[PDB]
């Protein structure tokens, strides 16, 4: 007693918009550092009928029966997860049920400290995540600043994590968890030194590696598994999975953490797991452990170095003057334009990037930089040679952005009026669309 008609027939209205979405993706230079493009196999898992099943609980400890094949998949996903991040199933456990990054962080923090518990993270404006305890004088913005008590540390004037300030703050504040691993941080993290500070104040070390997960897994960057009590990661960014998250806990370092983490996810926070997600994550974790994926991850870094270097050669300033990873943050101060203006201009030429604070910015009010990353364009086949064209496109956007601000004024409302119809943008947009639309597209 159902309608078996395909999407085009059953909902022509929606299917056209989705077809448009597809076209915009195919025709965009996507520099969003947290975005990627899934392959067809991951999307087959996501549309699988496995999501019809209710599997509250854990493998072999389910509230309902008929979960034999579901258990096989959840167990397979955990095994692949632990292998991919080079950890022994005896020393490390993993939870694969969190629905997304934010949920996993909240659930994981709660497991370690509970309500009213004390946490330290990097300020949102310095490059930490919302779920790392972000708040405002005006409001407790994230639940992680409201269900917990949070202190926020900052990067120094050159954009680096200031460990001396972290220790100082940890010693007066006495937190139970200290979080590291970030949302817009262009360099590697010294986990060893974080561990040293945590030990000195008897705190958990929490590493959020969502942005760099592929680097940790492929032994290209520092390994936080050597020092962390908990490691969380999304599966949708550089990992190239579906939208989900993993939570890693070190059993050997903390007895009783497995139960704590596992009960925090269910039944403390979530109900039924989304089995299609878990299948898709399993699908991607097989690929992550291949030698071909290490090549892709290497290439992501090669492209990021090439991009930074080309941007520098065009006299564009980078926060920390470079990158160790997949992401760059441009300091736009010498051009006297805001990050928002450049976002609007790049939107108008089919280039996706976002505004991002820089150390000099007091607040997240008027961010003076943009953040770009290479995973999505590396997925689409661009190599180091192709990064010059992108740097060239960004430099032209910056120049137009300056000319438009000259002609219409600094106010954002005024500035946008300059954008529609502008001849240069139309020209630049077509170059973008012709070059972008040509590239391989899963």
Ligand X SMILES: Cc1[nH]nc2c1[C@](c1cc(-c3ccccc3C#N)cc(C(F)(F)F)c1)(C(C)C)C(C#N)=C(N)O2
| Residue 150 in contact with ligand X, rule: CB under 6 A | no
Measured from the CB atom, is 270 or 298 closer to ligand PLG?
270
**Long-range contacts, 344-348 (Cβ 8 Å, 24+):** 344/412, 344/415, 344/416, 344/419, 345/397, 345/400, 345/401, 345/404, 345/419, 345/425, 346/370, 346/394, 346/397, 348/419, 348/422, 348/425, 348/429
| 41 is a site residue for its own copies (CB under 8 A) | yes
d(CA 155, CA 183): 13
Residue 354 sits in the site that holds ligand X (CB under 6 A): yes
Would you say 62 or 167 has its CB closer to its own copies? 62
- Give the whole-angstrom CA distance, residue 33 versus residue 184: 8
Give strand ranges (E) for 350-392: 351-352, 354-356, 369-373
Kindly name the residue from 176, 187, 237, 277 that is annotated as catalytic: 237
Establish whether 64 is a catalytic residue. no
The reply on whether position 234 binds ligand PLG by CB under 6 A is yes
Q: Round to whole Å and give the CA distance between 391 and 328.
A: 12
Q: Which does 211 bind (CB under 5 to 8 A by kind): ligand X, ligand PLG, its own copies, none?
A: ligand PLG
- Could you check whether the bond before residue 267 is cis, i.e. omega within 30 degrees of 0? yes
Catalytic residue, from 74, 208, 324, 344: name it.
208
Q: Which stretch binds its own copies (CB under 8 A): 13-21, 88-96, 174-182, 211-219?
A: 13-21
Q: Which of 99, 141, 143, 302 binds ligand X (CB under 6 A)?
A: 141
Q: What are phi and psi of 180, to 5 degrees?
A: -145, 175
List the interface residues with ligand PLG, window 309-328 (CB under 6 A): none
Q: Round to the nearest angstrom and report the end-to-end CA distance of the chain.
A: 35
**Contact criterion met (CB below 8 Å) for 291 and 369:** no
Which of 334, 320, 323, 317 is CA-nearest to residue 300? 323
> Is 243 one of the annotated active-site residues of the chain?
yes
Please indicate whether residue 208 is annotated as part of the active site: yes
Least distance to ligand X from the beta carbon of 141, Å? 5
Distance CA 33, CA 328 (A): 9
**187 scored as a contact of ligand PLG (CB under 6 A):** no
- Annotation marks residue 56 as catalytic: yes
**Least distance in Å: CB of 355 to its own copies?**
8
Shortest distance in whole angstroms from residue 305 CB to its own copies: 17
Q: How far is the CB of 211 from ligand X (least distance, A)?
A: 10
Closest among 441, 107, 440, 96 to 283, alpha carbons compared: 96
* Residues 128-167 close enough to bind its own copies by CB under 8 A: 129-131, 134, 141-143, 146-147
| Beta carbon of residue 120, minimum distance to ligand PLG (angstroms, whole number) | 15
Tokens of 167: 């220790």
272, 322, 429, 439: residue in contact with ligand PLG (rule CB under 6 A): 272
Rounded Cα gap, residues 144 and 148, in angstroms: 6
Using rule CB under 6 A, residue 211 touches ligand PLG: yes
Q: Is residue 320 annotated as part of the catalytic site, yes or no?
A: no
Is position 184 an interface residue for ligand X (rule: CB under 6 A)? yes
Does position 49 interact with its own copies (CB under 8 A)? The reply is: yes
Minimal distance, residue 27 CB to its own copies, in Å = 10
Return the active site residues: 54, 56, 208, 234, 237, 243
Positions that interact with ligand PLG (CB under 6 A): 34, 54, 100-102, 105, 129, 131, 181-183, 208, 210-211, 234, 243, 270-272
């Amino acid at each position: 007693m159902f309608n078996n008609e395909p999407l085009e027939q059953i909902d022509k209205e929606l299917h056209d918009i989705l077809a448009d979405e597809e076209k915009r993706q195919r025709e965009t230079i996507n520099l969003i550092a947290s975005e990627n493009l899934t392959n067809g196999a991951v999307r087959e898992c996501l549309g699988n009928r496995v999501s019809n099943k209710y599997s509250e609980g854990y493998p072999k400890k389910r509230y309902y029966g008929g979960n034999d094949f579901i258990d096989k998949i959840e167990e397979l996903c955990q095994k692949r997860a632990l292998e991919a991040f080079n950890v022994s199933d005896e020393e490390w456990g993993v939870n694969v049920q969190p629905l997304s990054g934010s949920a996993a962080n909240v659930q994981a923090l709660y497991a370690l400290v509970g309500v009213k518990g004390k946490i330290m993270g990097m300020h949102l404006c310095s490059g930490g995540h919302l779920t790392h305890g972000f708040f405002d004088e005006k409001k407790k913005v994230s639940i992680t600043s409201d269900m917990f008590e949070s202190k926020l540390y900052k990067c120094n004037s050159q954009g680096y994590v200031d460990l001396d300030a972290v220790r100082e703050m940890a010693l007066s504040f006495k937190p139970k968890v200290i979080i590291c691993g970030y949302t817009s941080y262009p360099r590697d993290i010294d986990y060893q030194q974080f561990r040293q500070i945590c030990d000195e104040v008897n705190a958990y070390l929490f590493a959020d590696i969502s942005h760099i997960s592929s680097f940790v897994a492929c032994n290209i960057l520092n390994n936080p598994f050597l020092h962390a009590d908990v490691v969380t990661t999304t599966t949708h960014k550089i990992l190239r999975g579906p939208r989900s998250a993993l939570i890693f806990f070190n059993k050997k370092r903390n007895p009783g953490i497995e139960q704590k983490i596992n009960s925090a996810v269910f039944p403390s926070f979530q109900g039924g797991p989304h089995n299609n997600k878990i299948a898709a994550v399993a699908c991607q974790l097989k690929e992550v452990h291949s030698p071909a994926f290490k090549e892709y991850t290497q290439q992501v870094l090669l492209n990021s170095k090439a991009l930074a270097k080309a941007l520098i050669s065009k006299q564009i300033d980078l926060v920390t003057n470079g990158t160790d990873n997949h992401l760059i943050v441009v300091d736009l101060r010498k051009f006297s334009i805001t990050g928002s203006k450049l976002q609007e201009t790049c939107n108008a030429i089919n280039v996706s990037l976002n505004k991002n604070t820089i150390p000099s910015d007091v607040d997240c009010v008027s961010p003076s930089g943009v953040r770009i990353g290479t995973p999505a364009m590396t997925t689409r086949g661009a190599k180091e040679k192709d990064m010059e064209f992108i740097a060239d496109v960004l430099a032209r956007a910056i120049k137009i952005t300056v000319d438009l601000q000259e002609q219409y004024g600094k106010k954002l409302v005024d500035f946008k009026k300059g954008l529609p119809g502008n001849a240069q943008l139309q020209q630049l947009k077509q170059e973008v669309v012709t070059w972008a639309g040509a590239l391989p597209f899963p």
